[model samples]
Target: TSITDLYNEVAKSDLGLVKNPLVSIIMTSHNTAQFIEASINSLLLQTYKNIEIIIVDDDSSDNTFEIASRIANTTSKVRVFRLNSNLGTYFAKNTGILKSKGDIIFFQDSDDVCHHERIERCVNILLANKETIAVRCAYSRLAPETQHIIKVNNMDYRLGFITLGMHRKVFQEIGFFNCTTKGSDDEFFHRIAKYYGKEKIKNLLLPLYYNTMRENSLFTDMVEWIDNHNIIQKMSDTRQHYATLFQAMHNETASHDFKNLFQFPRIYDALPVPQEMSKLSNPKIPVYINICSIPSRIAQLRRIIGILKNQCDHFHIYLDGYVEIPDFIKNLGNKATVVHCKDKDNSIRDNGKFILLEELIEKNQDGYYITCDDDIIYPSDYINTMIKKLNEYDDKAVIGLHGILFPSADRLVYSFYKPLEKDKAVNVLGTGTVSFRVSLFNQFSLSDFTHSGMADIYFSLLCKKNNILQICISRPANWLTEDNRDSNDEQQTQLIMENGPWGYSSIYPLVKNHPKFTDLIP
Candidate 1:
């Protein structure tokens, strides 16, 4: 059974006495009047049952404590109190932990929203993994460039432990939060690592916590702290305390290694990675262009070959039917390969034309693959541009220039809808300008590929199933066509090149109903 099936069954019963444990949320609120309501509301809406919140105020002169106290009076599970003075974060947190009655502990910040499933997912992971001391979430942002956007920050590790949930005994055993007045999460974690090592910490892969970036939060402070000290060096310097602690324990070599930890990506090191990232460090992965064409449209085919010839290590043109062969292009066999399909008389159709190329991709052990339309003005830097984005994942990546977020099987639109945004993690990347990690071809064979009408949608469903996000790349975003098809910048009302190839017609519904496509559609 999947995580979904288990979570649903658990939700129906809320786990009852079978293993429903009381979760203690130590919410430390300090001068956060602007965000406290939403933070508390996030807790109230949780799907996990048997939770008690301990709102520990840090002697905030603002309305922080008062609001929490008034809210607690109206709730069945909230408790409010204040520290004697404005102490450090973990100090306030420790006070609440001492007061907490549950074995499970969750530290809720005054400025973040925990998804309804965050607690539930955390609880399940903790119960299942007994050796794990804490589940620290790498969160997502409601980013905005004039509009709210969902950006994933899965690699970064937390210093302040803002969204950390743990076992109370781990805190009792690993020691409580110490140090000074500001962002103590990072320091506390470093200390925990110093004693327990990194193995006990479990990095939860889901971005269930939404960190609200305020004008004056710890995140901004973290940025400014290293802005002056040469970033990599500054990160390395912060390890002195941990380094000293280890030295005291007589591991002098481990201390030296810690000094250069930031030289490589330390944040992505210990955590449970959310995706396949083997290709990020490899630079020589050959780029291949797979073009599908038909006989009558051979005119549109040759020019495409010429445009992409220099952009790839291998040029493979798969023709579905008879196209007038030109000497320069047909005999261009030395530089490229123009071949007929092995099955079905080598014909090009709406989506199935890609089948020939898909069949050949299995032979590629490691590389990148791109599917080009028979006609388009190829960018001079197309391959380099796409590869640059592929390198962003630190390993394997799948990308397309044109991608869509659907409203359903029928309503086609770009991915802007919020409620369904998670369903569209770079979903519906059109093959006209899409690239997949060559390894994907192994599983690409697993797909039946029978639904050819909404071809892009069909392949997108496959991508979603494999957790192969069809990320975005923009340099060759333009897909030029003849007549109104290629009309991009003209003043007339031509359908945007992006809006083509994706709609709720023919095979769109079948594409939607596919079991693999379920989570991707909201």
Candidate 2:
């Protein structure tokens, strides 16, 4: 079809715009209760009257939610949602945007105020200049008391993040802002620039939004600020933060620099590898099996020990909390060595399990370390499967059967594990078939987490952070009672020991600022 015909088809669809389209004012706040009323009031009296106010609070400890609620009760135009957890300011903005049903979107910080004319002015510019993607507004940094512009040192008021108003469709086109604390804001703007060039941008000289000069604003290090590296961390971190953005903009900035730098490596293309390369020797590496046990799973623990005796080179076992030592296992005395964990809680075993892996590597730096959960019954070829996958690659990644990926940052529930390279993954390990190259151990350590499954989450992130990514072998590791037909006995056992869903197996938040992951919708 011709371009005009294609346009007319889309124009007849629901994607087409409406006259006096609804505008969404997404105002995000942390604990800034003092200024929320003013912030809400600014939108309440906007000269651009066709608008809805959406307030999203970032799990604040203060009365910010209560205040926003009070405002919502008095006005039908306002809606509010207080997150159960804090996912930072970026997520809060995302929450509000999703909750809103509007044609255009505008952002407001809780600490800042907008002039009544701000939205109307920005909307006018967008409507009149149909080619323009957005209008960047001028803003002033005001004193907490005076409401007067001080010699301002704030955002450059250019590229339109907070102070820009645009068609909400633009964000839907570019996925909602990436969920991270480092360089996320500037990165998104850079991406927006790539989508629509500077020619479509207009700067309104009138100051419409009030930029509050707070002590803990953008001047400090990023949200995931690392010590020792100082502010310098942002340079490299931003590269990663905007990785997808740069990938999105790849074609726009194609290069012309290295045209003939290497010319063609004709010798490499025409020649074959030397015979010495084909005759590379294979070295026999030892296998170390590390297990952190539980007293009740002793029967299950015995199941693995019997199978591993012939398959593994060594075993390092440990127990946490109130697990007891059994005598039948004692008969296998020299076959196993138990290292009792001290001064540690029985909860997440990631930290304790790591300690055992390190001990094995200290004994033999060249061995492979396989870890397991107490009740996870290994497959017949578990050791060989992991070892086989390890040999398949250059040993630059972690291998396990179960892989976990969160393509969408919704933290509600999860399904079976499957991962691509660089995807968030864990072997869901321990009880599952998961093995690590012992030398990789020296370069990695367990990152502590506050919740039940946080161990795997952090472990996945940790390996990826070190350039040692997690891989999937899809070697199925089943639970002992998984196939048990007697529903009463097996379900009862899971209900008691494992605790059924909505159970105590995994507590939600141990720290006020824990991983804000929720279960998936499934």
Error of 1 at 170 (Å): 1.7
List, residue by residue over 457-514, the lDDT tens digit for candidate 2: 4454455444454554432112122211221344323322342222111222211122
Model 1 C-alpha lDDT per residue in residues 237-323, reported as the tens digit of each score:
334443344335334335334322212111111111112211122236666677766555566666666556645666666666654
Query: Per-prediction TM-score, please?
Result: 0.40, 0.43
Off by over 4 Å in 1: 1-19, 143-160, 194-197, 224-522
Q: Candidate 1: worst 10 consecutive residues by lDDT? A: 264-273
- Against the reference, the lDDT scores of all candidates come to 0.55, 0.55
Candidate 2: which stretches are off by over 4 Å?
1-19, 153-160, 220-522
Model 1 shows how many backbone clashes?
15
